[PDB]
C-alpha cells in the first residue's frame, strides 16, 4: 500500500531492496535473488533509482569495492547491444562508467563501483564473487 518491506530490506518505489554481503558469482547472486517474489539482482531504471541503490550500498565497507547488479550480456561480447536486465525490464536508463563498446574484451556482467560512489556501472568478470543487491516485491 504505502509500501512496506520484509525486515532486512528497504522500500523505494513499489519495490523492496536488500544488500547481501556473503559474496556470490553473478549467476549465483541472481539465482539467490529469485528465491524472493519476482526477485532478481537489482535493475536500475532511472537516475533516481540509481541514487537510492547507491545510498543503500555506500556503507558496505573497505573490504568491498564492487557490488553486483542485474545487468549482463548473454552474447558475451559477440553482439554492443547485448546487455540486458535479468528482470527483463526494458533498458531505459544508462549509467556506464565506461561504455563496454569501447573496451576490448570487457566483462560480461555489470557491478556498481566504489570509485564512482556506487552510482555508475563497471563491466566485470561474471565469475567473480561479490556482494549484491536484490530487488523484489512483497
Ligand atoms: Zn518487479
Ligand atoms: Zn539475460
Ligand atoms: Zn569475453
Q: How far is the CA of 38 from the centre of ligand 1 (A)?
A: 6
Q: What is the resolution of this structure in A?
A: 1.8
User: Solved how?
Assistant: X-ray
Torsion of CA 41, 107, 25, 54, to 10 degrees: -40
Nearest to 66 by CA among 104, 24, 8: 24
Q: How far is the CA of 137 from the centre of ligand 1 (A)?
A: 6
CATH code of 1-138, in short, is 3.10.100.10
Ligand showing the shortest atom-to-Cα distance for residue 76:
3
Q: Which residues fall inside 5 Å of ion ligand 3, going by CB? A: 77
81 annotated as a binding-site residue: no
79 annotated as a binding-site residue: no
Between CA 133 and CA 69 the distance in angstroms is 6
C-alpha cell of residue 91: 533498458
Phi-psi sector, 45: left (phi>0), alpha (psi -120 to 50), beta: alpha
Residues 6+ apart with CB under 8 A from 35: none
Amino acid at each position: 500500500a504505502r509500501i512496506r518491506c520484509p525486515k532486512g530490506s528497504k522500500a523505494y518505489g513499489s519495490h523492496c531492496y536488500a544488500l547481501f554481503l556473503s559474496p556470490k558469482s553473478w549467476t549465483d547472486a541472481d539465482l539467490a535473488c529469485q528465491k524472493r517474489p519476482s526477485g532478481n539482482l537489482v535493475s536500475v531504471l532511472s537516475g533516481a533509482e540509481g541514487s537510492f541503490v547507491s545510498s543503500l550500498v555506500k556503507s558496505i565497507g573497505n573490504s568491498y569495492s564492487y557490488v553486483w547488479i542485474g545487468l549482463h550480456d548473454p552474447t558475451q561480447g559477440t553482439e554492443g547491444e547485448g546487455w540486458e536486465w535479468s528482470s527483463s525490464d526494458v533498458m531505459n536508463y544508462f549509467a556506464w562508467e565506461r561504455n563496454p563498446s569501447t573496451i576490448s574484451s570487457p566483462g560480461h556482467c555489470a557491478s556498481l563501483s566504489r570509485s564512482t560512489a556506487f552510482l555508475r556501472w563497471k563491466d566485470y568478470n561474471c565469475n567473480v564473487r561479490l556482494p549484491y543487491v536484490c530487488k523484489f516485491t512483497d
